[model samples]
Target: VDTHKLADDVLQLLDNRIEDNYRVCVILVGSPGSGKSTIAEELCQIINEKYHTFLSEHPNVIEVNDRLKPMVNLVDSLKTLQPNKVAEMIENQGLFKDHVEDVNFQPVKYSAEECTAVVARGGTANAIRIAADSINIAQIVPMDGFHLSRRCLDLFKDPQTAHKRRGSPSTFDSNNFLQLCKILAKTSLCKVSTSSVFEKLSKTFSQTIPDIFVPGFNHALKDPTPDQYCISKFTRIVILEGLYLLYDQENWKKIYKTLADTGALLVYKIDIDYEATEERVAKRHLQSGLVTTIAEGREKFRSNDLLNGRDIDNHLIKVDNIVHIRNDH
Candidate 1:
């Protein structure tokens, strides 16, 4: 709602600085469909209008959506979507597989003539340069669904069992999600059995570990490396908006460190109710015209469990909070 207020806060922080002083970067954080993309667009528009010369003359103000692989419909369904029957149906159509998995996507079109075009980066763990002229801000607009990474998925196979034993509202073939939930629920130390489900998950996870964390395709086969040619010329802010940016603190800190080495990192937190967050995804399904009675049914349940809690605090990330340590980084 007060999206501009967040932008204004970032702007105010930058106002005190003289031209060519320390560059400022803002990372707008929010749940899926939490208006992060919209806000980023709006902020870019405002900057172009209010400081046309500042943008045109500098050509450094940039906004980018850190794009990840588009959700694989049937494959994702097989990985998620309870009642396995529903997943089977979706998979049958061959509708949901990584549409942009190994390919590169151009930047999103924006009307901010003064500002740099909004480039969209694909793949979750891919790295990008963060050079900004004066002020740099990166808003990571996360994709829909808070599904765990393949690593996490491999750790928690047999979602049905996890649902029953772990008391998880929903289950997926990822220990990452369950482990994160445990951390979130303040029960990370419960120590569930590591022999059966966890063991299989681990074994499967190890097989894919190399590809999962590779920064980009140029360096690895899993992810297509970011187009350095796009922003190589300018020193611009880098904002990364995604669901799991804050999920694992240690990993993010290291990721942020990479961003910082290139430029500064500023984060914006979007606090909202879990149910409201889920509904936001539903609305997107409807808007995309991808919604059907069946899709709605699947989504209703998905959103319900995904964001079952009533507390906003339970759903949103607190700025500057780190949960995992990049001891290795």
Candidate 2:
């Protein structure tokens, strides 16, 4: 995907939804080696850039409103100026003729209705800013964290089967991630206010939301680590990226139901060339130092990631958007 364009498109959606939604959850599902992580990183970077820009541009209410007050004043004052005198008013009126200094202030005038753009510029700048401060921060929640630890798999009755199918949906701790999804869904569906939209701003997020922590996968150790990531109270945009988020199998149906409760789960899925995916997955396996050689890596892909990828295709729930990426290799 063109990551910047994708990021910009997601931001445009968020901008439109930010007002009505206290929390907007975007779901990204893809097969192995489909670049979910790439888009996730770009999305986070773009949102963070926008957030810092928002901070630098609109530090305080007075600073924002102050610019607006002057814009209206300047535009209104512009109409009162002498039309023909504006060009020669300074030079011929002897304002700076005898001055040794190079300083010069040229006058200009415009009264056309098109001139209202002066105020609109001020409005547009402020318009880009989110009305509520909590809405700007976006967080990425990857499902890799919910992978079953190798030790956990060791206890399985069919340990060999579990080890071989490690990347498949059955190998994941789906209930744990599903629990997290339910919490996010509840928060998202909760109406911020019963009355005016203005009242919603006064409800402090800290008072209402508890701290949420999630586990993450440690590739080197090959285990899931607790508290590896946190979804803070201030995060209003949550991007859920994973292989099975849109899967609608028996246990996963509940997760889809929970996500649907929000009524705004913007789902996206990635479709990629299967041969490219197989090649890339094996290369990644080799790089992880988990497999000894190219042949071993390819074997792992054939037995694990490839199987998982096919399952992802076969058992998917529908998505809101589909992205196709072709690999040069």
Candidate 3:
């Protein structure tokens, strides 16, 4: 596939739609090792570079995966707490209401030293408060696909099915992710104003809307620490990458309808085969030191039927604007 041609087409499409108060969301969907993330990043860089001189600001290409990390951290914490029960709840499709409630939702009190630490990092009370509120709420319930509810994790615990079903669509809350994309799309349409005194004050002290929040990852206190690039204001183009964005017809229809309603949405599918995918996964495992054998990787690729290009294309092609990239190389 011609990267230049694809980038040109994407830019042309952006130019056509971005004029009439519309924001475009480009969703890149693919198997685990199909290089969707790499392609998305490359496309974003190309688009930003191409339009840098024309626009006042560079377009923000936020990754859905970045937004999902906090939730992943939260879920990881819960799994650490009660592996067996969490596993059972996940398998039974039961609510993790108790587990969420059981977490100690204590008020945060920043000392002079703590405040200094935050301030030293260019953070302010307002920013910390916002991050705290977000983390507190997330602790109460699963916020996005990354933070799967206790029930969602159950599929991975069953030895017989674990190998095949580890990261299937059922393991994620796609609806939440879709809702967030819509919110971001709408945000891009409107400008933020600090007209009121309170708004101005909040803006003065508040850090940029945090791009990422990971509980207990940065500091020892289990508090949500601000991480990643915060989207202060919306950009004209948004790119989302996920394994199961177009996994099923129902989800595809809902996501497509939402994007259509809010703005233009384009779907990109990165196509690869079983052997190629396994090889990529194996390489990734070696680099990252993640635990997974080639057989397990192959099983996962096969078990998640959406990984089959034919099946995914059958559903995705029904949508209006979709692109396919063969990425075996």
Candidate 4:
């Protein structure tokens, strides 16, 4: 039940400065309702609190830092837009089929005060001027962010099955997810550097490390939100949690190979009970207002969630560890 020990062990493993473009990634995969997201969130909170303490012990660093304080980042100032334009932007999600294909979300590094206000409304990515100046250390990324938009799903050959089995590996943008993984894995190999438009314009400010943007999911809207989260320069450890990250299939297997070759990836799967997995998803269905009754929710899970769970259990990939081991009778 105590996740701190594992967190501490991970921190110890990462107890040194990494190279400029390098990152150590910890990926977790599990079935639906396997508590992957909750555990990942807890780990992020624990590790970030440790960083805050590291900063607190150095009071002089904090005083000098407040002069150029940085916290959360903005993708394209969604907040600066008028309310109607904001609505228009959000409403414009599924209009394009290749919605999640683009990753040109250039972030604006905002002051720490603006961070608190935005955090009150929701969450954001953390990107700083450079890796050394950042007191923050880790960021949690979820695979749900890459789900194919609902409108995109309708174009499928079998649209009904596509919508029903939306959480399956096929429903997600695995290749795009692989692109993010590859970019983060840049530390492993030093390839040719190209000065894209964003890279060129980034020099105007104090920022040096390029920020990469990833999409996030909005359950209410049933679509993906572009540029929702960022992997900042200070983020040496990227903790990713999702359903099929370790699934030994085409794109997923490539993602595993990509991270494995880095020699800095740790893949873990939750060893939780499967008996009540459908019941868990059923409860979530109720809360999400997707289905009214418990029976309806269970039936929905049977059609989709349970099917995806089978694929998850079947196409297993080797992992560094299986954590929690909660198989209590």
| Total backbone collisions for each predicted model | 33, 0, 1, 0
Candidate 1 similarity to native, TM-score = 0.40
Report the Cα RMSD per candidate. 18.5, 24.3, 12.6, 10.1
lDDT of 1 by residue, 1-329 (tens): 55456556545544432122223445554544455667666765554344444455535323322123231111111122234533442354311123222112221212121221121222122222222224322222222222222322223435344333221212211222222221112210111123321122112211110111111222223223332222111112223444444433323323333333322345555655545556666676576555775458346536544333222235334445332211110
Candidate models: Cα lDDT each: 0.33, 0.56, 0.43, 0.58
Best by TM-score: 4
Poorest lDDT segment (10 consecutive residues) of candidate 3: 133-142
Query: Residue 95 of candidate 4: its Cα lDDT?
Result: 30
Q: Which 10 consecutive residues of model 4 have the lowest summed lDDT?
A: 116-125
Residue 232, model 3, lDDT: 31
**Which lDDT tens digits does candidate 4 get at residues 1-329?**
45687577566545432222245678887787888888788888887777666556554432211224442232233233344533443465413232332223222223230231111011121112112224556788888886766776775667788687677777766655665566566633321142321122122122333555567888778777756667765565789999878888767777877876776677677765655767787888898888899888888767664433776777877655544334223
Choose 2 or 3, whichever is better by lDDT: 2
TM-score of each model, in listed order? 0.40, 0.68, 0.54, 0.69
Runs of candidate 2 with Cα error greater than 4 angstroms are 61-136, 193-206, 290-292, 299-308, 318-329
Candidate 2's displacement at residue 29, Å, is 1.2
> Which residue pairs in candidate 3 collide?
90-151
lDDT, residue 154, candidate 4: 70
Give candidate 4 misplaced runs (Cα > 4 Å): 16-21, 60-134, 188-208, 299-308, 319-329
Please list the residue runs of candidate 3 whose C-alpha ends up more than 4 Å from where it truly belongs after superposition. 51-164, 188-229, 249-252, 285-317
How displaced is residue 191 in candidate 3, in Å? Answer: 8.5
